[PDB]
């Protein structure tokens, strides 16, 4: 996104590619920038969140539910990604959409048992993402918002019996009463590769000079798929040694619980 | 003999610098990249290293070009019908065959089709003419002919569709190249009567083009065989 001159980029590379790596800001290779998160502001929805970054990057997530027959509806969690002033079709949109749907699959990184109502019916979860503004790869930004939203989601409570095979009662839900959606949303961390250094939460200027990048998912206190290498820019993309890949996975594996801990506060 | 005759893309050919011992004196061979080769950086065991690496699948040819002796060797890779020829690009001094796309009063813009090589043979630039991806060039009214540079009637010089052999003075901007037909061997080469509606016309006089078929004569800027 950001446009920089050849001189500025080289200086940034020198600052960040140094053996004692220094952020232009001054951050450490594992320090995130401060974010603000709002939740439960959309009463029309079952759950909602709004995340604001330090560079003005803003993302809004909404959670809606629908009763479906899990015998015909394979995917019980659908992620939808959007950006105002941006066409839906764009390569970045579909890629993030495809990626996010894999991160939150029914039988991969999500306890889909908590969505089951009866033998025959279950709750389909629609996770709608709206990226108002972003200056870098918003994959990690969206991930934090989806997490916050799914941890403050409330679904209707069933009243009728849960055996459609025999008695076959029509799904009825008691008025007013609702049950909080107990689930373990995964997180998606993005890393930047500048020389032999690995940075958590790459800034805009940092990503521009990066040699490569990593997209690493996180669930149940361990590294999980999808794991994707990603070109943060397209002018300075280079191959990387395998030890860097193992360094990145190790880096996430030790700093993720700290992030989750700061994120798990109700 | 030290370097492989034929190299695939990514195959190491020769290091940055080289030297040998002959006649009781050290002769320094300076290896420089060429068409089909690219000087890149490779590091082994924490050691940095620069070496000439071929980027095209071809036989490899070297050629010398310029007390204690001094030398310069040119390392290149040549492929080895279909012809691509990308390395070839309009540069100041080259001769280029163009076709007139439109006529204005103070200038005449064309499009580049082929470029003359060096010792005739030409390099055809393949592109879509119905898109605009083809390189465009502009011939100024002052660059039409050395005779009377000030006042030149562009209508009586070129014509839409006529083929013009010219030489590019400069790159110009991204839109238009600079073209001059000032010399004798430059001008309208192939053309037809009535913007291409009539029969073929041939070049007789430098400022006159006639057609030995319908007897038609149109005023053009003709070159010399």
């Amino acid at each position: 996104h950001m446009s920089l001159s050849v001189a500025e980029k080289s200086y940034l590379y020198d600052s960040l590619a140094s053996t004692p790596s220094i952020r232009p800001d001054g951050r450490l290779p594992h320090q995130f920038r401060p974010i603000e998160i709002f939740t439960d502001f959309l009463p029309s929805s079952n759950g909602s969140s709004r995340i604001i970054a330090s560079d003005g990057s803003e993302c809004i997530v909404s959670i809606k539910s629908k009763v479906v027959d899990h015998h015909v509806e394979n995917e019980l969690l659908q992620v939808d990604v959007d950006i105002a002033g941006q066409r839906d079709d764009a390569l970045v949109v579909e890629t993030i959409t495809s990626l996010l749907n894999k991160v939150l699959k029914s039988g991969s990184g999500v306890d889909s048992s908590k969505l089951q109502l009866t033998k025959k019916y279950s709750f389909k979860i629609f996770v709608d993402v709206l990226v108002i503004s972003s200056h870098s790869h918003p994959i990690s930004l969206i991930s934090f918002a989806i997490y916050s939203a799914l941890n403050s989601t409330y679904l209707p409570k069933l009243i009728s019996a849960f055996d459609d095979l025999e008695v076959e009662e029509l799904p009825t839900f008691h008025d007013y009463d609702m049950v909080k959606l107990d689930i373990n949303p995964p997180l998606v961390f993005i890393l930047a590769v500048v020389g032999n250094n690995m940075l958590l939460d790459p800034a805009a200027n940092e990503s521009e000079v990066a040699n490569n990048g990593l997209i690493i998912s996180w669930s149940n206190g361990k590294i999980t798929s999808p794991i994707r290498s990603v070109a943060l820019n397209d002018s300075n993309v280079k191959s990387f040694k395998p030890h860097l890949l193992k360094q990145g996975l190790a880096m996430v594996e030790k700093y993720a619980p700290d992030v989750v801990r700061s994120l798990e506060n109700l | 003999f030290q370097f492989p005759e034929i190299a695939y893309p990514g195959k190491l050919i020769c290091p940055q610098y080289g030297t040998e011992n002959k006649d009781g004196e050290d002769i320094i061979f300076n290896y420089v990249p060429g068409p089909g080769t690219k000087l890149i950086q490779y590091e082994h065991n924490g050691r940095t290293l620069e070496a000439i690496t071929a980027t095209l699948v071809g036989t490899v040819r070297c050629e010398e070009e310029k007390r204690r002796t001094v030398k310069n060797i040119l390392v290149s890779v040549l492929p080895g019908a279909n012809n691509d020829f990308a390395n070839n690009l309009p540069k100041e001094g080259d001769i280029v065959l163009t076709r007139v796309t439109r006529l204005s009063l103070q200038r005449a813009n064309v499009e580049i089709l082929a470029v003359e090589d060096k010792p005739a043979t030409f390099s055809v630039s393949q592109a879509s003419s119905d898109l605009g991806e083809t390189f465009r060039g502009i011939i100024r009214s002052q660059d039409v002919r050395s005779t009377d540079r000030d006042r030149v009637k562009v209508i009586e010089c070129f014509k839409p569709g006529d083929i013009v052999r010219a030489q590019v003075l400069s790159l110009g901007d991204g839109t238009n190249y600079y073209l001059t037909t000032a010399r004798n061997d430059l001008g309208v080469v192939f053309a037809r009567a009535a913007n291409g509606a009539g029969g073929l016309m041939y070049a007789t006089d430098w400022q006159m083009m006639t057609s030995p078929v319908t007897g038609a004569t149109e005023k053009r800027k003709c070159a010399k065989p």
Partner: protein, 236 residues
């Protein structure tokens, strides 16, 4: 004697005929053949050896020709000239700044975009942008070509405009003079400029010329002006 395209020509091949609108000389076969539908008009001068012809046909899309009087509108200004369009959806024409009386490289004309100008086409090539000039040498010492002020402009087919400019037997200018004072500019590009002292008279002229353009009748036109100038009175 109506003439249609592809029609046989009586004239002999050895003897040339001067080109006229409607008449086409094939660049390939060198044959002279009519391409428009209408009345053939031929003029012969002297006992022998010269001829001229054209076809009066109904067309409304103007094509610039040398020594044609046209009324254009200057949409925009370039570095050394005005961009003026004679007609809608038609190629732009090049008008030189230096193509004015008392011209100088220091002082550009005061014409603004949206002004009407009376102009004559000097150089008009098929494959080149046409050019017009405010002053025409042929007419006289003074062209009488200057940008029009106010008034009203009228769309009219090329035939009706050509008859209004070259034919003195055309009663239109006479029947309008019998009703009111008016000044008129006539363009071969099918444009007619009309201006009176009062708007009601200019409007009345507009409506008459339009109907005359529509009606195409000598008898109707005299009456037409009668009912038009009458209708304005009551409308007043």
């Amino acid at each position: 004697t109506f003439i249609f395209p592809g029609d046989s020509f009586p004239v002999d091949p050895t003897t040339p005929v001067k080109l006229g609108p409607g008449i086409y000389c094939d660049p390939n076969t060198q044959e002279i053949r009519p391409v428009n539908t209408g009345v053939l008009h031929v003029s012969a001068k002297g006992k022998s050896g010269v001829q001229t012809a054209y076809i009066d046909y109904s067309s409304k899309r103007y094509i610039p020709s040398v020594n044609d009087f046209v009324i254009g509108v200057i949409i925009g200004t370039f570095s050394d000239s005005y961009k003026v369009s004679l007609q809608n959806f038609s190629s732009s024409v090049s008008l030189s700044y230096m193509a004015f009386p008392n011209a100088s490289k220091k002082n550009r004309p005061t014409l603004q975009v949206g002004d009407l100008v009376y102009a004559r086409v000097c150089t008009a090539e098929k494959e080149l942008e046409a050019e017009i000039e405010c002053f025409d040498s042929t007419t006289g010492r003074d062209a009488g070509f200057g940008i029009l002020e106010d008034g009203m402009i009228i769309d009219v087919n090329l035939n009706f405009a050509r008859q209004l400019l070259f034919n003195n037997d055309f009663p239109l200018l006479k029947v309008l003079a019998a009703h009111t004072k008016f000044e008129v500019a006539i363009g071969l590009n099918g444009k007619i400029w009309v201006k009176c002292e009062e708007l009601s008279n200019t409007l009345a002229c507009y409506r008459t010329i339009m109907e005359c353009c529509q009606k195409n009748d000598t008898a109707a036109f005299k009456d037409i002006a009668k009912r038009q100038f009458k209708e304005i009175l009551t409308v007043k």
